[PDB]
Amino acid sequence: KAKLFKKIGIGKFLHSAKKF
């Protein structure tokens, strides 16, 4: 799952932010 790009703990923010 988390074994492709190099950002998993720094992309969840900008993601959750635009999520709600």
From Swiss-Prot:
Q: Which domain of life is it from?
A: Eukaryota
Protein name per the record? Magainin-2
- The organism named in the record is Xenopus laevis (African clawed frog)
Q: Which residues of the full protein are shown?
A: 129 to 140 of 303
